[PDB]
RNA sequence: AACGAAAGUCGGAGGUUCGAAGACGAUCAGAUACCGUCGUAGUUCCGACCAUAAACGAUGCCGACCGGCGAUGCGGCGGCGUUAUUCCCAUGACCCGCCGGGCAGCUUCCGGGAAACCAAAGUCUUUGGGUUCCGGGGGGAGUAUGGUUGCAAAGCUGAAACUU
């Protein structure tokens, strides 16, 4: 059955982005996915989106300018300490100059360079580049 | 079998593309034409070339040949239609009423030159 | 086009589109032509919306007048109902015609004698003329196509919706394209009717020319 | 599809401990029956006494009589 | 692209698609660049100024060049708003 | 080498079709791998119907037809030329062959 | 050798072997 | 397609879809009132009701349970509420 | 050298001034003296393999020779051409012509702390042809090309100073291994980095601007 | 732990045809094989066992996403008409669409693949949704032994030495 909702949402983004489409519809809507897509939006990768409210777990309609090469998930959520962040950003990212790892820390859900600047580590969520 | 091979019906056509102002419908004139206009080795090729340009001039002046160029159209621009009243000038154009709803919602149909005809009953358009 | 009222439809153009049978499409629908149909009748025919036909025709005429040289816009017709319209349009505008059989390699084989290199391609019907539509993919040609409701939109860039099946509507659509290009470029003023009848662009059948030659 | 959750290290390691035995070098060098049937017993060389001198012919595309000793 | 002295070190900057914003490469031989001419508002004649749109070939192969030309011409005032 | 996608059958979505026996060699084939053929002719031949007709006591008696339903195995069709081997790219033609001009 | 008959011949061999081993 | 708006769907394509596959799911049943023609109880029925809805004047049946909509008894009068 | 293409008459006249205007509009290069015109003194080739391939007939075997050739100008430019013909010098000559016709530019990028001139591929690129999947990885300054010999030739020819490689599959068949490395380094000018996010201005085409020169 | 084709084994009833083994004929140098005549055990049923098949989609299961098209099976909804006949007649049979689930199809430069081909065997070096059994060059061999299941035929678990 459906496990780990964030993964199936990001595979929906990726399959509908590779076809060059302009808008996706994501279902369900966590509060994990709204902070994750906040992270991808603030870096200028997806633009605006809407959280459609039915009284069940909602849907999300995302605008897409294709700027997004890959949006992926890491499952299970491995504990990433601050010495294991360089070993993880060497593996998943395509460059030292761009690409990001999103990881869920005790200051909030954040990307991997902010977690070095805030001096904290936590569990990994996925990546986008 | 008397089928003409590649040289006697390609060389005859490249003889016909240029030099059309000299050729004609009689074989004995074109046979004598063919030595000023070419360098052909011996005459049996030249009689076969003359026989195909006589057969091609027998063909060509009543319509277009596929292999011949638009030097033919230089002959048809040198030698060669509408009606008086056009076939799109008809005075009643039958319109089945879905088209009339389209024209009403395109801000036309206040002007009436058209006449809407009765809609069809039955939807049997498919084949079994 | 353009949200301009000098370029809008008049009742004379709409009477030509009604009398020719441009608005009567086919009985099948390729799934990315359904932004042009108004509704499907009881007969099974889909009705082509004529305002979409006019706005795509004027956008096509904008694309055709946007080339400085008129000699490297090339027009294709392989089927018999559009050959005379292609030759009349090419004599009217100064385009280059290719009517009849289209030998493959005429855009990509450089050493063959008919090797052209045009800058735009206008074809008659995008299913029967798919050989220059596929050969437009190696030479970077944008391609304009007069498209029926059941006609595939692979490799065409500007689809002009019409009934490209009959004689009258093909001859009319090439006539309206010639008229919009010659008005936009500056040759004919917009206010007079153009002095060329659409019957110069229609197809003449051998039975139709033999019934015209034997008069009563 | 593999078993890839977070508390599943025992299934993965007791899988790869058992499917290592289908690898032929691990089975041939870690089961112990190879070292008992080998005439050296894991040495590099062995000293021995020549019983009888033989000649053996080569395999089929070659033709020779190879000189060997028992 | 741009090193620390501010220099632009790239060979060239490739075009991007107007429909999908993919990088039209050196050997995307099915990609187009299409001019669509403007007209003057009072006379309806071509006055020399252009609109330029580029579509990569992979959008063209799946039949989606027509609708993107219709949307891009609709949003820059060529197709009417009905 | 997969040769045919349907494997030369009509068994899609069931486990077992009950077999029939061939009419020419009595070889037990399944019901749908066998090549069914329905042969209708007149009972009297085309030749002898010209002189049957002078012997009938009934005026205007149209003679009956013979309704034979034939199953055939896959070996005895290519022996009996009912069904013959075709190209790799015209095997996707499953229109039955024309009997009309 | 067709592998069913190789199977059948090792079947006959094992049937004769278990015949000869349970006499004692 | 491929520029298609998912946030503003048209009502033709919102009465087309299955009742779970809309943006907001909404049921395809409705509440009626059945008027029996020889009595004066306005009686409230479901559209898709599964019991025989008995009226209390002249004790007749208004509707019949079927797999879809309940077929009302012929000659009564109904309208949809709200 | 009499040109036959429209691009050739723009190039054997000083109308196209660099090769990246031809690459920039994806204009198809169809004659090999344009690459001899632009790159000139800096073109060095090296022949990769000469393999005999044999066709069985009732006349015995009929043996061909199939040559691979790499070419390149070592800042940006790399080509690989395969031409199979009956004599070995004929196969090498045709492979050099086809290797000039397939030259693509390489986008080279940096490792971190980007001072200076670009020394590696900008990102991890992967190319696949046959069964060989050849991955090219950015590297530090001054590590050399860590690879097999056949892509070391292709990566040292393109002007890439540093790379790390990982290759999967049956690499011994040389054609797929060099074609997969050529698919790996022809792909760096299709990869959308965050610095190529800037919105493009469109300039006039070479055939659009030089079209009143060309009609003479 | 339940079911598991056919053959097989045991107890009983039944036995028309087919039919291993077998007895004869004839084809061949020879056929103790195909080809004919007859036939036991079996095929058939009721109880008790055995658990293997090219048990095949040679493709584990649950969920997601990703182009089209025209029919077909079932259930539902909405639409010109046409037909009952024996009451505008009831309800069914057809016609044009829509939604869900299902057996399959044709096409496609989505994508994959070594290719055959596949709308999954796709979304995979731009590599992690969950989970179960299993493969590691070819033979040796599914053999030897050991274990256990079975009245028996056998089943499951099941290796080396050596060789290439
Ligand atoms: Zn048979």
UniProtKB/Swiss-Prot annotation, chain A:
<dbReference type="GO" id="GO:0022627">
    <property type="term" value="C:cytosolic small ribosomal subunit"/>
</dbReference>
<feature type="modified residue" description="N6-succinyllysine">
    <location>
        <position position="87"/>
    </location>
</feature>
<dbReference type="GO" id="GO:0003723">
    <property type="term" value="F:RNA binding"/>
</dbReference>
<comment type="function">
    <text>Component of the small ribosomal subunit. Part of the small subunit (SSU) processome, first precursor of the small eukaryotic ribosomal subunit. During the assembly of the SSU processome in the nucleolus, many ribosome biogenesis factors, an RNA chaperone and ribosomal proteins associate with the nascent pre-rRNA and work in concert to generate RNA folding, modifications, rearrangements and cleavage as well as targeted degradation of pre-ribosomal RNA by the RNA exosome. Required for proper erythropoiesis.</text>
</comment>
<keyword id="KW-0539">Nucleus</keyword>
<dbReference type="GO" id="GO:0045787">
    <property type="term" value="P:positive regulation of cell cycle"/>
</dbReference>
<dbReference type="GO" id="GO:0022626">
    <property type="term" value="C:cytosolic ribosome"/>
</dbReference>
<dbReference type="GO" id="GO:0005654">
    <property type="term" value="C:nucleoplasm"/>
</dbReference>
<dbReference type="GO" id="GO:0003735">
    <property type="term" value="F:structural constituent of ribosome"/>
</dbReference>
<dbReference type="GO" id="GO:0005737">
    <property type="term" value="C:cytoplasm"/>
</dbReference>
<keyword id="KW-0963">Cytoplasm</keyword>
<dbReference type="GO" id="GO:0070062">
    <property type="term" value="C:extracellular exosome"/>
</dbReference>
From Swiss-Prot, chain B:
<protein>
    <recommendedName>
        <fullName>Small ribosomal subunit protein eS17</fullName>
    </recommendedName>
</protein>
<dbReference type="InterPro" id="IPR018273">
    <property type="entry name" value="Ribosomal_eS17_CS"/>
</dbReference>
<dbReference type="GO" id="GO:0022626">
    <property type="term" value="C:cytosolic ribosome"/>
</dbReference>
<dbReference type="Pfam" id="PF00833">
    <property type="entry name" value="Ribosomal_S17e"/>
</dbReference>
<dbReference type="GO" id="GO:0003735">
    <property type="term" value="F:structural constituent of ribosome"/>
</dbReference>
<feature type="modified residue" description="Phosphoserine">
    <location>
        <position position="110"/>
    </location>
</feature>
<keyword id="KW-0832">Ubl conjugation</keyword>
<feature type="modified residue" description="Phosphothreonine">
    <location>
        <position position="127"/>
    </location>
</feature>
<dbReference type="GO" id="GO:0005654">
    <property type="term" value="C:nucleoplasm"/>
</dbReference>
<dbReference type="GO" id="GO:0005840">
    <property type="term" value="C:ribosome"/>
</dbReference>
<dbReference type="InterPro" id="IPR001210">
    <property type="entry name" value="Ribosomal_eS17"/>
</dbReference>
<comment type="function">
    <text>Component of the small ribosomal subunit. The ribosome is a large ribonucleoprotein complex responsible for the synthesis of proteins in the cell. Part of the small subunit (SSU) processome, first precursor of the small eukaryotic ribosomal subunit. During the assembly of the SSU processome in the nucleolus, many ribosome biogenesis factors, an RNA chaperone and ribosomal proteins associate with the nascent pre-rRNA and work in concert to generate RNA folding, modifications, rearrangements and cleavage as well as targeted degradation of pre-ribosomal RNA by the RNA exosome.</text>
</comment>
From Swiss-Prot, chain C:
<dbReference type="GO" id="GO:0005654">
    <property type="term" value="C:nucleoplasm"/>
</dbReference>
<dbReference type="GO" id="GO:0070062">
    <property type="term" value="C:extracellular exosome"/>
</dbReference>
<protein>
    <recommendedName>
        <fullName>Small ribosomal subunit protein uS2</fullName>
    </recommendedName>
</protein>
<dbReference type="GO" id="GO:0001618">
    <property type="term" value="F:virus receptor activity"/>
</dbReference>
<keyword id="KW-0677">Repeat</keyword>
<keyword id="KW-0689">Ribosomal protein</keyword>
<dbReference type="GO" id="GO:0043236">
    <property type="term" value="F:laminin binding"/>
</dbReference>
<feature type="modified residue" description="N6-acetyllysine; alternate">
    <location>
        <position position="88"/>
    </location>
</feature>
<dbReference type="GO" id="GO:0005737">
    <property type="term" value="C:cytoplasm"/>
</dbReference>
<keyword id="KW-0675">Receptor</keyword>
<feature type="modified residue" description="Phosphothreonine">
    <location>
        <position position="96"/>
    </location>
</feature>
<keyword id="KW-1017">Isopeptide bond</keyword>
Curated annotation (Swiss-Prot), chain H:
<dbReference type="GO" id="GO:0005829">
    <property type="term" value="C:cytosol"/>
</dbReference>
<feature type="binding site">
    <location>
        <position position="39"/>
    </location>
    <ligand>
        <name>Zn(2+)</name>
    </ligand>
</feature>
<dbReference type="GO" id="GO:0003723">
    <property type="term" value="F:RNA binding"/>
</dbReference>
<dbReference type="GO" id="GO:0005840">
    <property type="term" value="C:ribosome"/>
</dbReference>
<dbReference type="InterPro" id="IPR023407">
    <property type="entry name" value="Ribosomal_eS27_Zn-bd_dom_sf"/>
</dbReference>
<dbReference type="GO" id="GO:0003735">
    <property type="term" value="F:structural constituent of ribosome"/>
</dbReference>
<dbReference type="InterPro" id="IPR000592">
    <property type="entry name" value="Ribosomal_eS27"/>
</dbReference>
<dbReference type="GO" id="GO:0003677">
    <property type="term" value="F:DNA binding"/>
</dbReference>
<dbReference type="GO" id="GO:0006364">
    <property type="term" value="P:rRNA processing"/>
</dbReference>
<dbReference type="InterPro" id="IPR011332">
    <property type="entry name" value="Ribosomal_zn-bd"/>
</dbReference>
<feature type="region of interest" description="Disordered">
    <location>
        <begin position="1"/>
        <end position="22"/>
    </location>
</feature>
<keyword id="KW-0863">Zinc-finger</keyword>
């Amino acid at each position: 059955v459906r496990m780990n909702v964030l993964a199936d949402a990001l595979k929906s983004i990726n399959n509908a982005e590779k076809r060059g489409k302009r808008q996706v519809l994501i279902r369900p809507c966590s509060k994990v996915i709204v902070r994750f897509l906040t992270v991808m939006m603030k870096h200028g990768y997806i633009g605006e989106f809407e959280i459609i409210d039915d009284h069940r777990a909602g849907k999300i309609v995302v605008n897409l300018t294709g700027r997004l090469n890959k949006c992926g998930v890491i499952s299970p959520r491995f504990d990433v300490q601050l010495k294991d962040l360089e070993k993880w950003q060497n593996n998943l990212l395509p460059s030292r100059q761009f690409g990001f790892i999103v990881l869920t820390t005790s200051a909030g859900i954040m990307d991997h360079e902010e977690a070095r600047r805030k001096h904290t580590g936590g569990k990994i969520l996925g990546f986008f580049f | 079998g008397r089928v003409r091979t590649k040289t006697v019906k390609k060389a005859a056509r490249v003889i016909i593309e240029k030099y059309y102002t000299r050729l004609g419908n009689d074989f004995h004139t074109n046979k004598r034409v063919c030595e000023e206009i070419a360098i052909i080795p011996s005459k049996k090729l030249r009689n076969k070339i003359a026989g195909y340009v006589t057969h091609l001039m027998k063909r060509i002046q009543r319509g277009p040949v596929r292999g011949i160029s638009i030097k033919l159209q230089e002959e048809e621009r040198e030698r060669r239609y509408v009606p008086e009243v056009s076939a799109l000038d008809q005075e009643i154009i039958e319109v089945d009423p879905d088209t009339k709803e389209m024209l009403k919602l395109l801000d036309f149909g206040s002007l009436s030159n058209l006449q809407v005809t009765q809609p069809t009953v039955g939807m049997n358009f498919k084949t079994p | 086009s353009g949200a301009l009222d000098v370029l809008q439809m008049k009742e004379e153009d709409v009477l030509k589109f009604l009398a020719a049978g441009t608005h009567l499409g086919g009985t099948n629908l390729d799934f990315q032509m359904e932004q042009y149909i108004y509704k499907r009748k009881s007969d099974g025919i889909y009705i082509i919306n004529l305002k979409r036909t006019w706005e795509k025709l004027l956008l096509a005429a904008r694309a055709i007048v946007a080339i400085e040289n008129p000699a490297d816009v090339s027009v294709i017709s392989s089927r018999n109902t559009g050959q005379r319209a292609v030759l009349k349009f090419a004599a009217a505008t100064g385009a280059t015609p290719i009517a009849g059989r289209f030998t493959p390699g005429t855009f990509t084989n450089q050493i063959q004698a008919a090797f052209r290199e045009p800058r735009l391609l206008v074809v008659t019907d995008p299913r029967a003329d798919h050989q220059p539509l596929t050969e437009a993919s190696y030479v970077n040609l944008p391609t304009i196509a007069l498209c029926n409701t059941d006609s595939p939109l692979r490799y065409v860039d500007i689809a002009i919706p019409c009934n490209n099946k009959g004689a009258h509507s093909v001859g009319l659509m090439w006539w309206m394209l010639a008229r919009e290009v010659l008005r936009m470029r500056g040759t004919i003023s917009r206010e007079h009717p153009w002095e060329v009848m659409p019957d110069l662009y229609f197809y003449r059948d051998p039975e139709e020319i033999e019934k015209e030659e034997q008069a009563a | 599809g593999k078993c890839r959750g977070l508390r599943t290290a025992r299934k993965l390691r007791s899988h790869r401990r058992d499917q290592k035995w289908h690898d032929k070098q691990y089975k041939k060098a870690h089961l112990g029956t190879a070292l008992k049937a080998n005439p050296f017993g894991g040495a590099s060389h062995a000293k021995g006494i020549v019983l009888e001198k033989v000649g053996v012919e080569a395999k089929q595309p070659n033709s020779a009589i190879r000189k060997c000793v028992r | 692209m741009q090193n620390d002295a501010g220099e632009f070190v790239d060979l060239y900057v490739p075009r991007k698609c107007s429909a999908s914003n993919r990088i039209i490469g050196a050997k995307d031989h099915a990609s187009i660049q299409m001019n669509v001419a403007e007209v003057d508002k009072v006379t309806g004649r071509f006055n020399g100024q252009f609109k330029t749109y580029a579509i990569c070939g992979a959008i063209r192969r799946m039949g989606e060049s027509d609708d993107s030309i219709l949307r891009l011409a609709k949003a820059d005032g060529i197709v009417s708003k009905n | 080498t997969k040769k045919r996608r349907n494997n030369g059958r009509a068994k899609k979505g069931r486990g077992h079709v009950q077999p029939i026996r061939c009419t020419n060699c009595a070889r037990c084939v399944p019901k749908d791998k066998a090549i069914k053929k329905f042969v209708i002719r007149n009972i009297v031949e085309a030749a002898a119907v010209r002189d049957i007709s002078e012997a009938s006591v009934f005026d205007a008696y149209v003679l009956p037809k013979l309704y034979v339903k034939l199953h055939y195995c896959v070996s005895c069709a290519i022996h009996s030329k009912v069904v013959r081997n075709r190209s790799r790219e015209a095997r996707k033609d499953r229109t039955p062959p024309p009997r009309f001009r | 050798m067709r592998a069913k008959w190789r199977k059948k011949r090792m079947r006959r061999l094992k049937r004769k072997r278990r015949k000869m081993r349970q006499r004692s | 397609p491929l520029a298609k708006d998912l946030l503003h769907p048209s009502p033709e394509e919102e009465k087309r879809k299955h009742k779970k596959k809309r943006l907001v799911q909404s049921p395809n049943s409705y509440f009626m009132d059945v008027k029996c023609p020889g009595c004066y109880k306005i009686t409230t029925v479901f559209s898709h009701a599964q019991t025989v809805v008995l009226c209390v004047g002249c004790s007749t049946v208004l509707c019949q349970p079927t797999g879809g909509k309940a077929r009302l008894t012929e000659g009564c009068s109904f309208r949809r509420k709200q | 050298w009499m040109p036959v293409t429209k691009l050739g008459r723009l190039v054997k006249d000083m109308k196209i001034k660099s090769l990246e205007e031809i690459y920039l509009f994806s204009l198809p290069i169809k004659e090999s003296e344009i690459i001899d015109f632009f790159l000139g003194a800096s073109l060095k080739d090296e022949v990769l393999k000469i393999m005999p391939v044999q066709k069985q007939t009732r006349a015995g075997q009929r043996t061909r020779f199939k040559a691979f050739v790499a070419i390149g100008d070592y800042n940006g430019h790399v080509g690989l051409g395969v031409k199979c013909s009956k004599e070995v010098a004929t196969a090498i000559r045709g492979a050099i012509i086809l290797a000039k016709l397939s030259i693509v530019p390489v986008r080279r990028g940096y490792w971190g702390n980007k001072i200076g001139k670009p020394h590696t591929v900008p990102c991890k690129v992967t190319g696949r042809c046959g069964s060989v999947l050849v991955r090219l990885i950015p590297a530090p300054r001054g590590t050399g090309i860590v690879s097999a010999p056949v892509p070391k030739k292709l990566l040292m020819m393109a002007g890439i100073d540093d790379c790390y490689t990982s290759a999967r599959g049956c690499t011994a068949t040389l054609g797929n291994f060099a074609k997969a490395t050529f698919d790996a380094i022809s792909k760096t000018y299709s990869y959308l980095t965050p610095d190529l996010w800037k919105e493009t201005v469109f300039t006039k085409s070479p055939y659009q601007e030089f079209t009143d020169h060309l009609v003479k």
